[PDB]
Design a binder for this molecule. Structure first.
Ligand SMILES: *[C@@H]1O[C@H](CO)[C@@H](O[C@@H]2O[C@H](CO)[C@@H](O)[C@H](O)[C@H]2NC(C)=O)[C@H](O)[C@H]1NC(C)=O
Ligand SMILES: *[C@@H]1O[C@H](CO)[C@@H](O[C@@H]2O[C@H](CO)[C@@H](O)[C@H](O)[C@H]2NC(C)=O)[C@H](O)[C@H]1NC(C)=O
Ligand SMILES: *[C@@H]1O[C@H](CO)[C@@H](O[C@@H]2O[C@H](CO)[C@@H](O)[C@H](O)[C@H]2NC(C)=O)[C@H](O)[C@H]1NC(C)=O
Ligand SMILES: *[C@@H]1O[C@H](CO)[C@@H](O[C@@H]2O[C@H](CO)[C@@H](O)[C@H](O)[C@H]2NC(C)=O)[C@H](O)[C@H]1NC(C)=O
Ligand SMILES: *[C@@H]1O[C@H](CO)[C@@H](O[C@@H]2O[C@H](CO)[C@@H](O)[C@H](O)[C@H]2NC(C)=O)[C@H](O)[C@H]1NC(C)=O
Ligand SMILES: *[C@@H]1O[C@H](CO)[C@@H](O[C@@H]2O[C@H](CO)[C@@H](O)[C@H](O)[C@H]2NC(C)=O)[C@H](O)[C@H]1NC(C)=O
Ligand code: NDG
Ligand code: NDG
Ligand code: NDG
Lengths: 418, 418, 418
């Protein structure tokens, strides 16, 4: 209840009681080498060759710690020597063309077998690239999901992902088989009852095997363990402390001291191997129900003992035995006689100064973790800036003048008599 | 032994005793920047520039927390003007060829200095690629081997790989120097005695220094600590519990209670700073040897105390004070009078329901962790599909007709008289 | 002091006293997807597509555990049929040129639109490459900085980097707000008071949210807790042990026993929720000040109790009740009567053998962790080795002979009469 805080007794903890047993075994088999494409191309043989190599460099130590555990007549002749020499000049132009047509034809299948020789080059780079990145993502994924197991041979608390994969996704089913509620997983994992340890590792196949161990818990209703602490308050004796156990468990109208030696405690759940309770004095039970007039006090204390304590980011102090100075909101703190002890939290004070120390009962820290990616523009020297049109045009035009200069020639024959 | 389980006393733990001391220091110096090729090419300057940058973004915080701690006469003339104009048409075809031969020659050293300009491009990409992947593998390798040390300044349990590297591979030698057996490494690492902490980090060289601390253990034979717990069994008094210590150590015929406050316990090994034993009542020693008739009982118990407990995934319960209902294999469970307490495990029951809770004494979970890699086929627009043969052929053929049309011309002169 | 070691009492621990409270909350919001370049190019859509995919495959499990919690006349005619056929041979050479000039022009815009088609290909690969590597560095960076939080839903000890980012770099300011000194951070983080747990995760935006919890500590000067242990030394009784508490706290001239149940201990700092001290016998206080003649002894011990213990990599043993054999430096060890107990460390012995075990008080292990990167030289088939100069030259030269063979023709006409 609450009136028990009128005798220096304050409830610090309140959690449910559970009984567990490590009677659930599993076996997660991890395939270090991902499933390569059906194409089976040896173009990704480069990124993988290095990936598989960094696996042996990373797993061997782990596997090691397991394996060991007339006058005109001269003109008619001159004309002959003129056209017999003209044909001599045409036969050469023909050789220059019949050999240049080869220099162009030879250059055809060249640039063709060089662009087609690049079509298979760039094709490989894109594949190698994708694989190189996709393969790195996996190695940085395993060292996160199964890090704890890779980094140590002995039992290590599993990873959510590792467990998520174990249940095959269907989590609500896994929990039910163990007897765990939805609002109890956070504490279940944070208890070290979900451990795992490597068992068999193959260097060749790169296939890691892990042995999982899960607990079977049985919740106990109507039974809740309560943690109790006490401060110093003046009484009939004078400056004494209330006498109450540290941990108690209640069922209906039965209250007894709980031995937390057989149990693993959390923030809101206690998983116990066994339950051992002890009978408490009748004067104690009477008090814990509300009868504050039943609690016994004693001077079991020294001079260096503190008149306060910490509870859930708060400070519970006796402000009549110590001046509670509230800094941020100026003024001295106190409480009605109904409560022998004052509770100071964030709702009434941000900075407090007690006898000796100065605790800060408030604070806020908001930060952002991001990354600014900047890519460099590597100017590629490769450019398509070949301008041979100035020469090409002078040909498409020079040919025109060669055709008409011939037309005049061929038309000068239309005027020949005989 | 086993007959002690006839008085409600059950052996839960059984481990060897060890004496240890943190008198072994080491120093692992990690080279964050790998050994670059002797070629010293500045083609891998891109992947490294970013890698070295993410190291300072990842290590600075760590280093920070350390730095601060006639009528025919007209024909003879007409023929002249016919061939003087024909040569006029040949001189132009020559200019068109002598300028096209340049347009082709200029295009030669172009595509040549563009394919050769690509031969050094693709060459760089392949290098950059390999480095980019190889360098990522290392960063995802260090955050796994030396993660614990990078993530925290204070002492942190080393990684198998970190230790494996420390011993230089030869592990059997390292253990011998510390006095550790082969079948004792699993517990040795899982004790937190193999810790390490960063000491000196250089931002420039990217060279991390870690201080290792190893224990020197001395095994004690003939001495084994045994953990003992007790349940409630009806006796001369009626509904009482046997009185026996929690931890005891035996040597030959000497049995005494062991103080486990100076020791770190494991699954099968206890590493102790010291050994403190206490003498136990003669009535106790007599019992632990086999004389069950010597053990004393007492009603040190409450009403909320459990009539059972958990042991190695099993449930040891008194099935005469509580109805043990076996679910999976229907039927009530009990045991011969020879054993006051019943042991229920997987070999006799898969699901049990006791007074209050229902524990599951069996379960199997097999899962597989893999990754399906699928690469995309980026169709490269670059193709070698230049078909200039239709035009090329029309030349290799048109030249033939130009050669024979000239042969007729040159043969029409063989029939000239003078 | 030191004279207390003349009664078998040795100081093992010496740390400062602190009062803490979890009254400091923070919220680190992590942007899983980095800030892409302003260019917004879809050329990095490949590496990111896979990166974002491995995030959902890595975070969903985490988010899941939160969402649910004449005769010559014949000659004048023969000459006509000679040049009319010669022009017939020139008109064809013209067609072969006017069609080859097209085969070259068509090949111009081809290799041009294939090199320019590659200029945008290589450009993309370089971008994709840089992004692929830069993006991998981030995923291997987060699984290290926020690994503990990604791997578990419940509270987990933060990472230096995570905290460094929280304080926005300015660390000296953060500590001051909590009341932590510079030479106290190592112990502060290694206490589990700097915890954090995921609270909200968005699958779409890939934005992780973590709730941070920091303590507010108030140092206590003039007060230092001291850990005390005792060995067996012969006295008036004979073979007994000194009687002194395990932990004590002193303030000025006030010495009392300290209850370390409310406190978290470290290597040099104790962070306590509260301080509970107990009064000790006057005979005890007198001794701890120096009056060794005031300490009481008792035979509270068994036969299996050890005559030694471990302290900071050393062994404190009674070398008059046990023969201390120093191995490395041969000889038996002992100490002046002034000190009832001998302290054996590295400064006086490297290997020791006591009654039962043989501890090694010295050792050094230096190792180096590095990586040798070797890149492969993938010979690119793409080469610029087109040598069409042998054919090109035969044209540039054949044209010369065609020009002069025509010059003779055109000069044979200069000798024509009419
Ligand atoms: C990954 O690399 C390791 C490197 O050791 C390879 O291990 C070899 O496995 C073959 C069989 O596949 C054995 O015959 C060899 O003895 C191993 N190498 C040596 C010399 O130890 C392994 O093959 C690689 N995995 C794959 C499938 O690529
Ligand atoms: C990364 O880039 C972002 C976006 O440009 C930067 O965001 C800035 O944040 C600061 C506060 O920390 C603001 O004052 C600026 O206005 C923001 N800039 C803009 C234009 O958005 C951020 O500074 C960069 N991160 C670092 C530290 O390099
Ligand atoms: C890795 O990157 C860091 C970024 O800080 C580099 O640090 C520089 O180191 C040089 C000496 O090599 C110093 O002169 C500079 O002051 C440092 N940079 C600054 C401005 O802090 C470091 O050089 C890089 N490492 C290598 C070898 O590439
Ligand atoms: C990845 O690919 C593998 C191989 O194709 C898939 O394996 C399937 O596994 C399921 C059971 O989980 C079987 O029912 C199928 O027959 C398997 N397929 C084949 C053809 O082998 C697997 O499903 C894929 N992983 C996921 C979940 O995407
Ligand atoms: C990263 O990948 C996830 C894969 O689930 C994407 O999730 C989708 O988010 C869109 C909105 O952006 C939803 O409409 C879809 O329903 C989600 N996919 C499905 C089918 O679950 C997410 O968009 C990706 N992130 C980015 C920004 O690329
Ligand atoms: C990686 O390369 C380095 C540098 O070559 C090697 O360094 C050698 O280290 C050993 C001792 O471990 C020396 O004996 C050699 O002289 C060193 N070699 C040289 C030339 O420096 C190292 O061996 C390589 N690492 C491994 C194990 O492959
Ligand atoms: C009709 C003609 O003979 N002129 C062509 C013209 O058509 C063409 O565009 C140019 C470039 O290819 O070459 C020349
Ligand atoms: C003999 C001859 O002049 N014809 C050639 C032939 O040999 C060659 O294959 C073709 C393509 O190069 O051009 C033409
Ligand atoms: C002057 C002349 O007509 N000869 C040219 C020469 O100049 C040139 O270097 C060669 C290769 O391009 O072709 C031919």
């Amino acid at each position: 209840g609450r009136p028990l805080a009128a005798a220096g007794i304050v409830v610090t903890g309140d959690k449910a009681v559970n009984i567990y047993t490590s009677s659930q075994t599993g076996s997660i088999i991890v395939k270090l080498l991902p499933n390569m494409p059906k194409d089976k191309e040896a173009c990704a043989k480069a990124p993988l060759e290095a990936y598989n190599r960094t696996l042996t460099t990373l797993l061997t130590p782990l596997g090691d710690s397991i394996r060991r555990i007339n006058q005109n007549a001269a003109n008619i002749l001159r004309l002959k020597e003129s056209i017999t020499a003209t044909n001599e000049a045409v036969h050469e132009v023909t050789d220059g063309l019949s050999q240049l047509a080869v220099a162009v034809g030879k250059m055809q299948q060249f640039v063709n077998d060089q662009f087609n020789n690049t079509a298979q080059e760039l094709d490989c780079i894109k594949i190698t690239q994708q694989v190189g990145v996709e393969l790195n993502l996996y190695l940085t994924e395993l060292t996160t999901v199964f890090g704890p197991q890779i980094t140590s041979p002995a039992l290590t608390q599993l990873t959510i992902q590792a467990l998520y994969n174990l249940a095959g996704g269907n989590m609500d089913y896994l929990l039910t088989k163990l007897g765990v509620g939805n609002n109890q997983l956070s504490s279940l994992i944070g208890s070290g009852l979900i451990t795992g340890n490597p068992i068999l590792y193959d260097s060749q196949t790169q296939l890691l095997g892990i042995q999982v161990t899960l607990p079977s818990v049985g919740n106990l209703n109507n039974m809740r363990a309560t943690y109790l602490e006490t401060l110093s308050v003046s009484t009939t004796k004078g400056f004494a402390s209330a006498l109450v156990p540290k941990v108690v468990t209640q069922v209906g109208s039965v209250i007894e001291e709980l031995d937390t030696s057989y149990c693993i405690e959390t923030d809101l759940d206690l998983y116990c191997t066994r339950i051992v309770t002890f009978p408490m004095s009748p004067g104690i039970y009477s008090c814990l129900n509300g009868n504050t007039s039943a609690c016994m006090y004693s001077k079991t204390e020294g001079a260096l003992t503190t008149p306060y304590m910490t509870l859930k980011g708060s400070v519970i102090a006796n402000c009549k035995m110590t001046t509670c100075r509230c800094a941020d909101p100026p003024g001295i703190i106190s409480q009605n006689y109904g409560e022998a002890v004052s509770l100071i939290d964030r709702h009434s004070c941000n900075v407090l100064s007690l006898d000796g120390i100065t605790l800060r009962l408030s604070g806020e820290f908001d930060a952002t973790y991001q990354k600014n990616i900047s890519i460099l523009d590597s100017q590629v020297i490769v450019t398509g800036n070949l301008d041979i049109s100035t020469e090409l045009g002078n040909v498409n035009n020079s040919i025109s003048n060669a055709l008409d200069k011939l037309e005049e020639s061929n038309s000068k024959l239309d005027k020949v008599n005989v």
